[PDB]
Amino acid sequence: VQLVESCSASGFAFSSFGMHWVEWVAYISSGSGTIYYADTVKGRFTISRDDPKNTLFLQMMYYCVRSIYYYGSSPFDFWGQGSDIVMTQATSSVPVTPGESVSISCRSSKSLLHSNGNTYLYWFLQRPGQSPQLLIYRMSNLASGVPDRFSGSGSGTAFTLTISRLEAEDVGVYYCMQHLEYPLTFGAGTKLEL
Amino acid sequence: TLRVPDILALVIFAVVFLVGVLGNALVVWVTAFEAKRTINAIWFLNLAVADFLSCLALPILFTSIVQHHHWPFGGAACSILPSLILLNMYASILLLATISADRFLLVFKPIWCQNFRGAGLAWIACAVAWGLALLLTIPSFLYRVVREEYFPPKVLCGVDYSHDKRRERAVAIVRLVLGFLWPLLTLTICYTFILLRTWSRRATRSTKTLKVVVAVVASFFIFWLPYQVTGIMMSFLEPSSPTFLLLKKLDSLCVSFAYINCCINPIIYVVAGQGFQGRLRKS
Amino acid sequence: GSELDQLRQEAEQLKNQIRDARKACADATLSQITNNIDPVGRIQMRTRRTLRGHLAKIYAMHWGTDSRLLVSASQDGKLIIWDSYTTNKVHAIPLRSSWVMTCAYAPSGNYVACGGLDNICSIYNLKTREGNVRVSRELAGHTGYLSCCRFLDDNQIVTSSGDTTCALWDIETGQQTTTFTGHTGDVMSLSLAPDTRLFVSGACDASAKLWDVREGMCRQTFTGHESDINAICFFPNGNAFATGSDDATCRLFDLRADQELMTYSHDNIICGITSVSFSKSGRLLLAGYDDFNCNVWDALKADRAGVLAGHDNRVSCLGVTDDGMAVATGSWDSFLKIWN
Amino acid sequence: FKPXAX
Amino acid sequence: TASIAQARKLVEQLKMEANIDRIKVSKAAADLMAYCEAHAKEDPLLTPVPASENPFREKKF
Amino acid sequence: GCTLSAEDKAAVERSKMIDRNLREDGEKAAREVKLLLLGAGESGKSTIVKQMKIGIVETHFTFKDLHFKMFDVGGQRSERKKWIHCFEGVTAIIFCVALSDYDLVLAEDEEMNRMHESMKLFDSICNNKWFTDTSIILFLNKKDLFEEKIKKSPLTICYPEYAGSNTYEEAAAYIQCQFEDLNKRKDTKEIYTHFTCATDTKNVQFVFDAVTDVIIKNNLKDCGLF
C-alpha cells in the first residue's frame, strides 16, 4: 500500500477507506454520504472524489491521510507523502541522550472519554525531512510497522507519551491530535532536539 | 320521517363501513409487513391504503344522511372534502385495472418478465395509476359552490356549472367513458386471454383460475353498473323534470350499492391468498 | 477363510472383554449424584439483537475471541463478519463456491476458514495491509465434502471431510502432516479440547473417536447412538463432551470413565438435533432442534429450563460467547438472533 | 342545485 | 489378500484400545459437579445480572 | 445519531453501504434457471453434457435470452441423503439413461443389470421429500445401439413378463411407459421423455420448453391466480 500525492491510490481499495486532510481541512467518507469541512476555510476550498481514477481533488504543507472505521480498526494509518477543544503542550525542546526514558505531556480542557470508551488521542511522529507516521491511536494501542519502544498512558485531562529505551532513530517532532468531534484541533508543536 | 329508500341504504353504509375498516386495517398491516421483498405485496398495498382512506370518511356521509342534509362544516369543506373520497374510489378502480393488466403481462411473454422485472417498474405504474385520478378530480375542485336558504334555515353543497352546459357534458362523457369502459374492457380482455392460454397446456391447467376471475369481473360489473348508469343520466338530464327528482331519490341507493365493492374487495385477497393465516402470524 | 473367521472371533472376544471391563466400573450414575442440587429457575431469554441482511440460506456461524464479533456463511457465496454490539457489518467476503457448509474463526482474530462440498478449504486474511480480505491458502486433497473446520493455532488447522477422513494441515506449507482414518461412515462434526492437545470427531455410523494431535492416531471410541451424528462439543472443563444425533437424542460422554453420564430426549420431540453448545459453568446446555425452535437443558439434571422459540424455520447453527454474556442463534430462514 | 355528489 | 491385512490392522487397534485405565463413575460425577459449582459464580446466563452493567442490555437502539 | 461519536457514524454508513451492496448482489441470483443433472455415469451423462452445451461441476450457458446453470454432482461419490437438501429449490431436474444397457451387466454383480439400477435410482430421486413440486425431464440416449441390439438378442432377458412383436417401437414404448410408471403424484410433477441419438438438433428446444412451462406455472402460482 502507498499514497502518491490531489493524490493517487495504488495497491489498495480506495473505495472502502475514509479520507482526511492534515491542520484539518476536510473529511469525506466512503460513498461521499457524509462530508465535513473546517470552520476556518469553509467556502473557499472544496473536496471531491473520483473512485474510478482513485483521485481526490481539492479545489483551492498539505497531507492526505487514509482511515477506516470499524471495531479494532486503526485510523490514520498512512499519512501519505505531502466550542472547539484546544490542545496545548508546555514542553517545546528537551535535550536527551539515547538510553534513557523520555516523557512528553499533552493536556485537554474536557473529558475525552466518550461513552463508547474510546479516547480519541493520536500521537504521531514526524522525522526531520520525512512524512509523519502514526505511533499511537486511541491513546492505548500501538500502530503497526513501527518500533515497539514507544508507549503512552494518561487519564482525565492529562496524557503522556513515554519512551522506555531511547536510540539514535528517535529524533523527530511529536504531535498529539484529537478526534472527539469536528473540526479536528492540533496541539502545540513539541520538538525534540538532539 | 325518513323515506323508504334511505333506511336500506343507511344500513348498507353502516355494515360496509364497519367490515371495510376492519378488513382494510388487516390487509394494510399484512401487506406492509412484507412490502420490501415481494413484488406482489406492493401492488395490493396501494389498494388497501386507498380503500381504507376512502372508507374512513363514510361517517360524514352517515351523519349527512341521518339528518336532513346536516352540513355543520361551512363552505370551505364543501370545496375539497368530498373530493378526497371521490378521488380515492376512482384510484382504487384504476389500481384494480393495473393489477389486471399486470397479470396478463405475467402470463404472456415469460422471458421478458424474468430478466427485466424489478420493483421500480411496479412503483412507477402504481404512481401513474394514482396520478390519473387527479385529472378526473380537478373538475370537481373547480366547480363546487355553496347555497344558503333564507327560508327555514338550510344549506346545500353541490356543483353548479351555471351555464357551462357544454363543460358539464364533456366532463361527464370523459369520466363515464374512461372510468367504466376502459377498466371493464381491460379486465375482460386480459382475463379471457389469460384463461385461453392457461387452459392450453396440461402443466398449467387448474380450476382455481376460473373461480377468481369470473367472481372478480362479475362482482365489479354488477356492483358498479347501477351507480354509473343513474349518475350519468342525472348528469345529462336537466333539473326541471320530475325524473330528475326520482334520480335524486335513487342516488343514495346507487352510491351505497357502488360502495359495497369497497367491502367486497379484500375478501377475495384474504380468502384466495396462499398462507394468509401464517402470514398474519409472522407479522 | 479360516484365518478371517478366527480373526473375526478374536475381534469379537476383544470387544466382549472391553465391554465387560467398561461395565465393571459402572457402579453409580450421574443423576443419582446430582439429585440433591437445587434446580435452576426459569431461564427467560429475549432477543436483544436481530441480525438481518442475508438474502439466502445460512449454514454456519462462529463467535469471536473477544466475544464481540462473529462470522456467518450463507448460500449466496457470502461470509459476513458482524458486530454484535452496535449491529454493524464489519466485513463481507464473496465466496468462489456457493455451496458452503462450515466456517471457522481464528483465535487471534487474523484468519477465517471457509470450505465445503468442494474438496477445497480456503483461508482468508482479515488483517491485510491492503485493507481488504483476500484468500491466502487453499488446502486440497480430500475426496469428500468438508463438514467441519477448526483452528488449532495461528499456523495449524484440522479439517474433517466426507471421505471418512480427518486431516491436519499447515498453512505455511499447504500439505497434510497427519491423517486420521478409521471411520466407516462419513464424518459430520469435530471438537477441540481447551488445551489443544486432543480432539473428538463423530461419524454417520453412530460412533465418536478421540484423536491425539501429537501422536496423530485414535485413542478411544464411544458408541450408543442409533442414527447419524450431527453435532459434538466438549465440556468447558475439557474431560467430557456431549454429542447430538439425528435420532432426537443427545448424550453426555466422559474421557476417564468410558460410560454414559446422561441422555437428553423428550417424548414430544421425534426429530433430531442440529447444534449443541455449552455455557461457562456447564450447568446450562443449548440444543438446537430442527422443529423450528431451540431448547435449553439442565446438563446436571437432564431437565428443560427454557425454550428459545423465536424462529420461523429450522435451526442450523448456534454459538455462545467466550465469557458467556449472551448466546447467538442462526436459523435456516436467513435471520440471526442474540438472546440474553 | 343538484344536491350531493357528481 | 487385503482382508487379512485389514483384519490384522483391526486386531492391532483392538489390542491398543484395551490398554486404558478406568475409574468409578461417582468420582467423575463429583468432579463435574465441583467444577460446575466453582464456576457458577461467573455465569451471566445462570443468574440474571442487573441491566446496569450488562453489555448486551436491551437499549433503546 | 446525536449519541454516536465522530468514529461511530462512519461505521453505520459503512454497514448501510454493505447492506446496499448485498441487496444489489442478491437480485442477480434469482434471474438464473437452475438445472440439476443426474444419471448413472455410464448411462450417457458426459455425452449429454457435451451435447446440450455449446466435487461438483458447474456450467453456465445462454439460449434464447435465458441463462441456465447446470449442476453435475456425479463425481461426489458420497452419501446422497446428507447433502441433497442443499438442492431444495432447483428449478428443474434432468435425468439421463441409456436404453441400450438392458443386456449389459454390472461389474460388481453379473446378476444385476444397469436398467434396474437406473429404475431404482429414478424411484429414489422421484419420491424425495424435498422434490414434491419439482419438474423432471427424462432423457433416453443411445437409441441406435439399442435398436441394433434388439434384433440379435431379444429383450425378454431384461423383461421376462413382456409379450410383444419384438420390434424397436414396441420395446421403446414399453420402456417409456415403465419409466413413467414410477410417478406417484401425477398432479404437481410431470415427466418429459425424449429420444435422441449422438447427433441431435432439438434437445435444447425440449429443455427450453420445459423450463418455460415451469416458469409460467411458478409465475401463475406467485400472484395467487393459480
Numbering used by the authors:
A (entry chain S): 2 to 6, 21 to 37, 46 to 83, 93 to 114, 136 to 247
B (entry chain D): 32 to 314
C (entry chain B): 1 to 340
D (entry chain L): 1 to 6
E (entry chain C): 6 to 66
F (entry chain A): 2 to 55, 183 to 354
What does the paper say about this structure?
Among these, C5apep possesses a high binding affinity for C5aR1; it also has a biased functional efficacy toward Gi protein signaling, in contrast to the functionally unbiased C5a. To understand the mechanism of C5aR1 signal induction in response to C5a or C5apep, we first determined the cryo-EM structures of active C5aR1–Gi protein complex bound to either C5a or C5apep at resolutions of 2.9 Å or 3.2 Å, respectively. As revealed by our structural comparison, the C-terminal regions of both C5a and C5apep fold into a hook shape at site 2 and are anchored by a set of almost identical interactions involving ECL2 and TM4–TM7, enabling the ligands to penetrate deeply into the TM helical bundle of C5aR1. RP8 in C5apep occupies the bottom of the orthosteric site, connecting TM4 and TM7 of C5aR1 by forming hydrogen bonds with the S1714.60 side chain and salt bridges with D2827.35; this leads to subtle inward displacement of TM4 and TM7 and a smaller volume of site 2 compared with that in the C5a-bound receptor. In agreement with our structural investigation, the S1714.60A mutation significantly impaired C5apep-induced cAMP inhibition but had no effect on the response to C5a. Additionally, K2797.32 forms an ionic bond with the main chain of PP3 in C5apep instead of the side chain of DP3 in C5a. In particular, LP6 in C5a binds tightly on the other side of site 2 to a hydrophobic cleft between TM2 and TM3, which is composed of I912.59, W102ECL1, and I1163.32 in C5aR1; conversely, such interactions in this region were not very strong during C5apep recognition due to the lack of a protrusion similar to LP6 in C5a in the contracted pose of the DChaP5 side chain.
The 74-amino-acid complement fragment C5a, which is a key proinflammatory mediator and an anaphylatoxin, is generated during the complement cascade by the cleavage of C5.4 C5a binds to the C5a receptor (C5aR) 1, a prototypical member of the G protein-coupled receptor (GPCR) superfamily, leading to recruitment of the G protein subtypes Gi, Gq, and G16 and β-arrestins and, ultimately, to numerous cell-specific responses including chemotaxis, phagocytosis, and cytokine release. The complement fragment C5a is one of its important effector components and exerts diverse physiological functions through activation of the C5a receptor 1 (C5aR1) and associated downstream G protein and β-arrestin signaling pathways. Here, we present cryo-electron microscopy structures of the activated wild-type C5aR1–Gi protein complex bound to each of the following: C5a, the hexapeptidic agonist C5apep, and the G protein-biased agonist BM213. Moreover, combined with mutagenesis studies and cell-based pharmacological assays, we deciphered a framework for biased signaling using different peptide analogs and provided insight into the activation mechanism of C5aR1 by solving the structure of C5aR1I116A mutant–Gi signaling activation complex induced by C089, which exerts antagonism on wild-type C5aR1.
